[PDB]
Amino acid sequence: SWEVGCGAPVPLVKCDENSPYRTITGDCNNRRSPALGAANRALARWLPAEYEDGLALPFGWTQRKTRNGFRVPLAREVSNKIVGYLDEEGVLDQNRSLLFMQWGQIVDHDLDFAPETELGSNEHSKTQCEEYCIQGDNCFPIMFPKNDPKLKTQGKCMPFFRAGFVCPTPPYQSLAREQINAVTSFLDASLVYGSEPSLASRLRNLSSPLGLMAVNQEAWDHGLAYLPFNNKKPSPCEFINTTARVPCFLAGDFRASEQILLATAHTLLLREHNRLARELKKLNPHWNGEKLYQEARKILGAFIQIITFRDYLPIVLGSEMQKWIPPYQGYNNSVDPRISNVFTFAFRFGHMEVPSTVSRLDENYQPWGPEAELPLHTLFFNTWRIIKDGGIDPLVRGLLAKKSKLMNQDKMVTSELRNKLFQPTHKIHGFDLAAINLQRCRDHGMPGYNSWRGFCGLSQPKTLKGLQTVLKNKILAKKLMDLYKTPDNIDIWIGGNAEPMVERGRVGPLLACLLGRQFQQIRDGDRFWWENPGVFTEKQRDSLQKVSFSRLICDNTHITKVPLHAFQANNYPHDFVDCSTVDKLDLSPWASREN
């Protein structure tokens, strides 16, 4: 079975045997083994890595090496022949807001992140890959099939650097290769406060004593705060509009500015943190800075947990929610709190829930301005459309009153992500999220679809007709088979996302299981979980399960009309109510009468 505890690139520094708030890094949540959950650890393996050479070469690296006796089809071919469509008409979800899609990506970003191998940006590494489409070491380029329009227009490939792997990063050569999770595995707002201690206090207002996060001093949203601007030049948010020179946002998470609505969701959360930390100096004026940061950090944490488990997961998982996430029976410190390698592919069902356009809505939820609807792809690394063109209230109104994309076996991923993705260093709106997600299953040595069906106790099809029956779809099945030649070779991402959806959910049985088990684990293995008796006082708890995303909007924007149930498809006048009609976070039980 072998390797016992390779624990290299980490400063070990041990634990603080009480510290009534979590570490920034996730360390010390588990007392038996303190690294469990922590960031800059290997993603857990639910099943063994599958590589060409059984060590680190991804399937389809060496042309004349099969997988179960067949070549693997090019990622981009799969993307083109299965994942593509033209007609955005009739593709939206009549019963899920755009908030449904946005929260997905919020929670996802809190849980897992496998950054690329740097290994030098003062090298051809970037050139030898993008420019010459040469496969080598960490350069794993997405080759185009023949008849591909990008042949005519871009080149022979689109760049792809393999994901960060533990012990070194300098090539390792003995046991199966394991990618890193650079955020804390715990639902702990790590995407707001950082997963490394350095960044964590950079994000903080140390200047004053009040316990705030650093807010923007260049620019404001009426009275209301923006995220601080991100140092690093080069900036991609600058690059897409050279004229506006509005750089990316600096959040706890580095993907914060990937698209306007996620930077938007980030901007609700900072505001809430500060809002919490004023109310506390209001009620507990003796409490110092640290105590106001951490005690606010603690509430926002529980807020993310409730919304997710109470509002989000029940409408992702549906019928299968109770089967996997039965009621809370308290902290089981034998539960693995870690994100699994497979879960970081399971959670990308989200990619099929992203619609082709984002609107900005006025106070009567009508086109704010003449350019109110925009193509998704203009909004990658787009920060200027926020500070120079209406703030967040009009984007939040969109989120509330526009709909998420329904996954459709025939219309999987909008060409806004499948042809027009911008990547932070490549200067063209010209990449393919879908082909990337497929190259990446291989990079991360993922087991085939059947292995994972196997894992969730579900049939393993070997035949076209066998596959028609599970996907409940003839032509989807024919194509998969024509490309993969066996269901054993189908990449977990696309495999999983081809299954019809479970009753009252937005994922299939295979995904429901993988996702179910993980949210089960991330709740049960968390020592700092909000419902874990002792973490919060019972009155604090009685206040907390009255919180609403509606409520989060009301206190952190100049928006006054909000739905009760912000994830269901909600129409203006009717399904919207006044903010006063909405339960608020009563922090009276936080009052410290130490005097």
Ligand X SMILES: *[C@@H]1O[C@H](CO)[C@@H](O)[C@H](O)[C@H]1NC(C)=O
- Hey, which residues are catalytic here? 109
Q: How far is the CB of 133 from ligand HEM (least distance, A)?
A: 18
Q: Are 116 and 161 in contact (CB under 8 A)?
A: yes
In the bound complex, what is the minimum distance in angstroms from residue 273's beta carbon to ligand X? 11
Residues listed for the chain: 595
Nearer to ligand HEM, 291 or 440 (CB): 440
Cβ of residue 416: shortest distance to ligand HEM, in angstroms? 8
Residue with the shortest CB distance to Ca ion? 190
What's the distance, CA 479 to chain centroid?
29
Residues in contact with ligand X, shown as a per-residue x/- string from 220 to 249 under the rule CB under 6 A: ---------------------x-xx-----
- CA angle, 76 then 81 then 104, to 5°: 70
For residue 92, the minimal CB distance to ligand X (Å) is 26
Selection from Ca ion, ligand HEM, ligand X, none that 214 binds (CB < 5 to 8 A by kind) is ligand X
SS3 249: strand
Footprint on residues 179-208 left by ligand X (CB under 6 A): 205, 207-208
Alpha carbons 347 and 522: distance in angstroms, whole number:
14
Q: Which does 259 bind (CB under 5 to 8 A by kind): Ca ion, ligand HEM, ligand X, none?
A: ligand HEM
Q: Which does 208 bind (CB under 5 to 8 A by kind): ligand X, ligand HEM, Ca ion, none?
A: ligand X
Tell whether residue 440 is among the known ligand binding residues.
yes
Q: Is 371 assigned to a binding site? A: no
Neighbours of 96 (CB within 10 A): 20
Mind giving me the DSSP string for 427-445? -SEEE-HHHHHHHHHHHTT
Binding to ligand X by residue 214, rule CB under 6 A?
Answer: yes
Could you tell me which of 255, 252, 248 has the C-alpha nearest to residue 196?
A: 252
341 binds Ca ion (CB under 5 A): yes
Interatomic CA distance for residues 39 and 335, integer angstroms: 17
Would you say 383 is a known binding-site residue? no
Instruction: Spell out the SS3 assignment of 271-334.
Output: HHHHHHHHHHHHHCCCCCHHHHHHHHHHHHHHHHHHHHHHHHHHHHHHHHHHHHCCCCCCCCCC
Terminal CA-to-CA distance of the chain, rounded, Å? 59
Q: Given candidates 342, 433, 483, 490, which one binds Ca ion under the rule CB under 5 A?
A: 342
DSSP notation for 108-130: HHHH---PBP-S-SSSGGGHHHH
Residue 109 annotated as part of some ligand binding site: yes
Nearer to ligand HEM, 430 or 589 (CB): 430
The nearer residue to ligand HEM, 165 or 576, going by C-beta atoms, is 165
Sole binder of ligand X in the list 63, 173, 198, 334 (CB under 6 A) = 334
The β-bridge relationship of strands 41-42 and 180-181 is antiparallel
**Euclidean distance between CA atoms 3 and 60, whole angstroms:** 27
For residue 335, the partner it binds in Ca ion, ligand X, ligand HEM, none, with Cβ less than 5 to 8 A by kind, is ligand X
| Whether 190 contacts 110, CB under 8 Å | yes
What whole-number distance in Å separates Cα of residue 558 and Cα of residue 393?
Answer: 7
The answer on whether 33 is annotated among ligand-binding residues is: no
Is 148 one of the annotated binding-site residues? no
Q: Is residue 258 part of an annotated ligand binding site?
A: yes
Q: Is 93 in the site for Ca ion (CB under 5 A)?
A: no
Q: Does 212 bind ligand X (CB under 6 A)?
A: yes
- The DSSP annotation for 19-56 comes to -SS--SS-TTSSSSSTTTT-SSEEPB-SS----TTSSS
Fill in the per-residue mask, 381 to 400: x = in contact with ligand X (CB under 6 A), - = not in contact.
---x---x------------
Of 129, 130, 136, the C-alpha closest to 154 is: 130
Binder to Ca ion among 21, 46, 85, 132 (CB under 5 A)?
46
Closer of 335 and 579 to ligand X (Cβ): 335
- Residue 31 is assigned to a ligand binding site: no
* Shortest distance (Å) from residue 243 CB to ligand X: 4
Binding site, residues?
A: 105, 108-110, 114, 184, 186, 188, 190, 222, 255, 258, 348, 351, 440, 558
Q: State the binding site for Zn(2+).
A: 222, 558
Interface contacts to ligand X, rule CB under 6 A: 205, 207-208, 210, 212, 214-215, 217, 241, 243-244, 332, 334-335, 384, 388
